[PDB]
């Protein structure tokens, strides 16, 4: 007889995730609304102690704006007798894979959500201030390129008053950066180390592969071969706990779709409700070509 152990290999990668960085907000019935405090107007004037009167100042705006939340639905069958036999539990696996697919679709939505019935992605919305690299004039052509100087000047130019802000990019980008060399043949940044290794634990490096990389796979743009493609996205940096907000309404729910199911079949119905919006995009900044 065969032996049964209690381990299960997965061998399936989801992605890197950016749902932890965004400002989490739990909500209720749809059409949420909140405040948009615009700018505190200069109230005082400063005073010499001579006059028996003050002077007024400009007021500010509030702009109680709002937003809608979107939903996610799905259905799937099951045989009835096939479920009692066939020792493995198909039901829990379907539940888990549905929650996971919903999670990955949520992650894709918050980044590149295309407007209509799609949580407006902060990439396509584009109210973030964006800087771009400068081209280099190799043998008199001024081709678009990118070196570490542009990276620093992008990361440092951030106003530290906003608080500590996280920077995100693709792992192909991290690799291409780490693969930079001086004229000596010596390394570049991330110098002293046979380690390199993207620790990235909290400090300013963070990687997601389900972001658009400007390396077109690899060995592209930047490479001894064909030059780089301009206008391509590179990286972002924001205080996501306040730069962009993700809103949740109802956990993934499943239900036996009574009606359409019989003593020989079962039909199910699952759904959930979530969304996201931009917070103060005047915090985060983007790097392009």
């Amino acid at each position: 007889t065969p032996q049964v152990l209690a381990l299960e290999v997965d061998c399936n990668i989801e992605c890197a995730s950016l749902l932890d960085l965004y400002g989490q907000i739990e909500v209720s019935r749809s059409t949420f609304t909140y405040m948009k405090i615009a700018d505190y107007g200069q109230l005082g004037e400063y005073t010499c102690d001579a006059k028996c009167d003050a002077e007024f100042g400009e007021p500010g705006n509030i702009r109680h704006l709002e937003g809608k939340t979107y939903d996610y639905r799905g259905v799937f069958c099951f045989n009835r007798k096939n479920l009692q036999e066939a020792n493995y539990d198909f039901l829990s696996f379907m539940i888990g894979a549905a929650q996971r697919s919903h999670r990955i679709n949520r992650n894709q939505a918050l980044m590149i959500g295309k407007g209509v019935n799609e949580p407006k992605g902060w990439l396509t919305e584009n109210c973030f201030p964006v800087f771009q690299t400068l081209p280099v004039d190799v043998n008199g052509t001024s081709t678009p390129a990118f070196l570490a100087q542009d990276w620093r000047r992008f990361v440092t130019s951030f106003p530290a008053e906003y608080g500590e802000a996280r920077s995100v990019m693709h792992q192909n980008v991290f690799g291409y950066l780490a693969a930079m060399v001086d004229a000596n043949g010596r390394f570049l940044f991330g110098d002293g180390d046979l380690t390199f290794t993207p620790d990235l634990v909290r400090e300013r490096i963070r990687i997601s592969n389900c972001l658009p990389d400007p390396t077109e796979g690899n060995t592209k743009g930047g490479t001894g071969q064909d030059a780089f493609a301009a206008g391509s996205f590179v990286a972002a940096q924001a205080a996501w706990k306040t730069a962009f907000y993700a809103v949740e309404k109802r956990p993934m729910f499943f239900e036996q779709y009574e009606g359409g199911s019989s003593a020989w079949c079962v039909k199910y119905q699952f759904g959930a409700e979530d969304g996201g919006f931009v917070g103060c995009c005047e915090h985060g900044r983007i790097l392009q070509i």
């Binding site: 070196l147 690799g175 693969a179 690899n218 060995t219 930047g222 490479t223 001894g224």
Partner: peptide, 19 residues
């Protein structure tokens, strides 16, 4: 209508990225 198969012809690849 499905199965899986492979033998280890995972011929290694190069990377080079100069500046």
């Amino acid at each position: 209508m499905d199965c899986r198969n492979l033998c280890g012809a995972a011929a290694p690849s190069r990377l080079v990225q100069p500046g």
